[PDB]
Design a protein around this ligand. Structure first.
Ligand SMILES: CC(C)(C)Oc1ccncc1NC(=O)Cc1cccc(Cl)c1
Ligand SMILES: CC(C)(C)Oc1ccncc1NC(=O)Cc1cccc(Cl)c1
Ligand SMILES: [Cl-]
Lengths: 302, 299
C-alpha cells in the first residue's frame, strides 16, 4: 500500500556523471563507453548565447580545450563532434561503470527520473514528466546543465533527456541524447517562452485508478461519458485531449479495478466541476498528472 | 528554480542490497563489510530466541546479484538479524548507523528480491510511521541520508500498518514508534503536522518567487503554539526557530513573521491558490533539505 512519486535508483547513472569545462564554463557530461555527451553551449562565452554559430565556435576548438574530470581523474579528450545540440567528446578511456543503455526520445506525458548534478557530482534524484508544452518542471540551479533524465527497464538505462536551459517562467528545456530539443526551443538566449501548459489527462486517470487500487473510491459516480463529451469538458479546464490510444492504454487498469475508462472519465469530469471539497486523493488536494499508466502498474503490482 | 521532492542519489546503497531467504520468506538485506542486516521476522507470538536457535547458517540463503554468499554466523540485535558472511562487500561505502527524530527526512531505496526498484523521499512522522510506498517483499528496504560521502543508515522496513502506513527500525533493530514485529492488533497513533518543516517549505516557496501568503504581521511563539495545537500541528520550539535562522536571514522574513503567515493559512485556507504547486501545506522538507536544494550540495 501507499503511493509515492518514485524515482528509479540512480546508481547506474551516477557512475556516468563527469564534469566538462571549456574556458570559464563548467557543466555536466554523461560518460558512456569512450564518449562524453554534454550540451554544446559549453563552448559559448555568454556573449555568443544571443546568436551563437556553434559550427564556427567548435571549429576553433582543439581537444585540449575541453577539460573532462571523472571523480579525481582527468580524462583525455581525443576527438570532438557535434550532433544537433549535443557535443560528443571522444575520450581515451572507456567508462568501466558504463551500464546497459539506450537513447530513447520520449513523448509529452511520459515520466522519467532526473539525476541533478553540479560539477560532475550528483546532488539529488527526482521524478519528472515531459509536459504537454515540452518543458519539464524541474529543480535546477546554474551548473545543472548536462544533468540527465532516464528510466530503467530491467537493468537497461534509457537516457531520454539532457538539461540545457531554464526558461523565464522557471520551467526547464532540454534535448534527447541525440541533441534534438524537446519543443520549439533553441539553445540561444533569444526571447523564448513556454506555450500554455495543460494537464496530462491520461496520467490523471491512471492516478485515479491508483487511488481506487489503494482503497479510495469517494470520487466515483454512477455516470459514464462518451469520449467526445469528455474531451469537450476537459478542454475547458486546460486538460489535454484524451485519445483512443489513451483509452486502450488504460485497459489493464480498467480490468483490474472493474471501472470502465469512460466511467473513470465521468468521475474526472465531476472532480473538475466540484473540486475535492476538503478531501484528498492519495494524500493530494490537486489532481496529480505526473504518473503514467505504466508507473501506476509498476508501483501497484511490481 | 523549481522545488522538487528530492531523494539522495541511491548508488552507494544499491551496491549493498542483497536478497535473504529463510524457509518460505524472501526479503531484502543490507550487506555492509562481512555482515548482512535484515528484519528478524525472516525466521518466522514469536519467541525469536527460540526460533533462531533452531536455525543453522545454511538455512539462510543470501544472494548478492547472481552470486550466492555463504553465511558463517548469525546473531540478533533487537529486531534486526545480523548474518555474518564469508565475503566482505567490496562496494561497502563509508557509513554510520544513525537513529533519526520524528520530522527528520530520509531517502528510501525500495527493493524486491534484493533488487532496487525505486527511490523516494519521506519523513519520519510525529507518530513514528512513514507514509511510504511498499508492497509484499519490500521488507528489509532501507532509509538513509548522505553527508559528503558517508551514508547514514537510519531506517529498515519491517511492516505495513492497517491504515497503509509503514513501520520499521533503525539499523540497530530498535523500532521507531510503539510497534512490535508480530501479527497482532497494532494501529498508528493520531498523526500531526511537522510545523518546522512547513515553515521551511514556505521559505522555499519565497526563495522560488511565491509570496502571496506573506503578510505584515508577526506573532509570539506562545500564540503561534496555541494556534498550532488547535490545527494538530507539532509545537514549534526555540530550537526550530534557531534552525530556521539562515532561511529567515536569506529571505528577510523573521521566523515569527512566517509563523503569522502560517497561522493565517491555517485559519483561512489557501483560497483557490497554491504554493510550490501544492494545495496543501507540505511538511516533508526539513530546513536542511530546503538549504541543500536551494544551494545545490553534491555527493
Ligand atoms: C538561473 C540560470 C542562470 C538560468 O541558470 C540555470 C538554472 C537552471 N537550469 C539551467 C540554467 N542555466 C542556463 O539556462 C544557461 C543557459 C542560458 C541561455 C541559453 C542556454 Cl541553452 C543555457
Ligand atoms: C500487504 C502486506 C502483506 C502487509 O505486505 C506488506 C506491505 C508493505 N510492507 C510490508 C509488508 N509486509 C508485512 O507487513 C509483513 C509482516 C506481517 C506481520 C508482522 C510483520 Cl513484522 C511483518
Ligand atoms: Cl514515450
Amino acid at each position: 500500500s501507499g503511493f509515492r512519486k518514485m524515482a528509479f535508483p540512480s546508481g547506474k547513472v551516477e557512475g556516468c556523471m563527469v564534469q566538462v569545462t571549456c574556458g570559464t564554463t563548467t557543466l555536466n557530461g554523461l560518460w558512456l563507453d569512450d564518449v562524453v555527451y554534454c550540451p554544446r553551449h559549453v563552448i559559448c562565452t555568454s556573449e555568443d548565447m544571443l546568436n551563437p554559430n556553434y559550427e564556427d565556435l567548435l571549429i576553433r576548438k582543439s581537444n585540449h580545450n575541453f577539460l573532462v574530470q571523472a571523480g579525481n581523474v582527468q580524462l583525455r579528450v581525443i576527438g570532438h563532434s557535434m550532433q544537433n545540440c549535443v557535443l560528443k567528446l571522444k575520450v581515451d578511456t572507456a567508462n568501466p561503470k558504463t551500464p546497459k543503455y539506450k537513447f530513447v526520445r520520449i513523448q509529452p506525458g511520459q515520466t522519467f527520473s532526473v539525476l541533478a548534478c553540479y560539477n560532475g557530482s550528483p546532488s539529488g534524484v527526482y521524478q519528472c514528466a515531459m509536459r504537454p508544452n515540452f518543458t519539464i518542471k524541474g529543480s535546477f540551479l546554474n551548473g545543472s546543465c548536462g544533468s540527465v533524465g532516464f528510466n530503467i527497464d530491467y537493468d537497461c538505462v534509457s537516457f531520454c533527456y539532457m538539461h540545457h536551459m531554464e526558461l523565464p517562467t522557471g520551467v526547464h528545456a532540454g534535448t534527447d541524447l541525440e541533441g534534438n530539443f524537446y519543443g520549439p526551443f533553441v539553445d540561444r538566449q533569444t526571447a523564448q517562452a513556454a506555450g500554455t501548459d495543460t494537464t496530462i489527462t491520461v496520467n490523471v486517470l491512471a492516478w485515479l485508478y491508483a487511488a481506487v487500487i489503494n482503497g479510495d473510491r469517494w470520487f466515483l459516480n454512477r455516470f459514464t461519458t462518451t469520449l467526445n463529451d469528455f474531451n469537450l469538458v476537459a478542454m475547458k479546464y486546460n486538460y489535454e485531449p484524451l485519445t483512443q490510444d489513451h483509452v486502450d492504454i488504460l485497459g489493464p487498469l480498467s480490468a483490474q479495478t472493474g471501472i470502465a475508462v469512460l466511467d473513470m472519465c465521468a468521475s474526472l469530469k465531476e472532480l473538475l466541476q466540484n473540486g475535492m471539497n476538503g478531501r484528498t486523493i492519495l494524500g493530494s488536494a490537486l489532481l496529480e498528472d505526473e504518473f503514467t499508466p505504466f508507473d501506476v502498474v509498476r508501483q501497484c503490482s511490481g
